Amino acid sequence: NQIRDTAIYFLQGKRYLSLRYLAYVLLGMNIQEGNHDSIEDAHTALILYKKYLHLKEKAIFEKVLNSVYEEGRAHNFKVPE
RNA sequence: AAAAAAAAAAAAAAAAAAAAAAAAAAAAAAAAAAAAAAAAAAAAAAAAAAAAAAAAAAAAAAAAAAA
Ligand SMILES: [Mg+2]
């Protein structure tokens, strides 16, 4: 009940996701720059966990999630630059 | 008066019993009767009778990270 892993709430196909593209899609793509700020990492993970909380209160996040999953696999889940 | 040594080396010696035609009995139904080395000489291991062997146990992984 305490591991609370935002990679696991949005996991797909045993592909342990790289949260750079997750923050580029689900929020502003400010986590696509660089410099590897850990405080930025935890803060964006906080924001994505809040996004999980909001759209799990909406409880329909798998629909648009799988739509943008297929859409980003047309992108092949790469880094948009 | 058939009157013989009275036992080495743990010697050595007894049996502890039969066709019965006694009386007017034919010619193997036995179940098989069945010997040869020795010129430096004969030589299975696995565990040993298939009187009934269906014999691919699904797979799919689009991929990571971890800024
Ligand atoms: Mg990652």
Expt. technique: cryo-EM
The residue among A24, A19, A25 whose CA lies nearest residue A66 is A25
Chain B: positions less than 7 Å from a protein CB are: 61-67
- Assess contact for A52 and A9: CB atoms under 8 A: yes
Q: How many CA atoms lie within 13 A of A10 on its CB side?
A: 28
Cα–Cα–Cα angle for A46, A19, A76, nearest 5°?
A: 150
Cα–Cα–Cα angle for A43, A57, A21, nearest 5°?
A: 40
Asked if A10 CB < 7 A from strand B, the reply is: no
Q: A31-46 burial, b if ≥16 CB within 10 A, otherwise e?
A: beeeeeeeeeeeebbe
| Distance from residue A17's CA to the centre of ligand 1 (Å) | 6
Q: How many other C-beta atoms can be found within 10 angstroms of the C-beta atom of residue A61?
A: 17
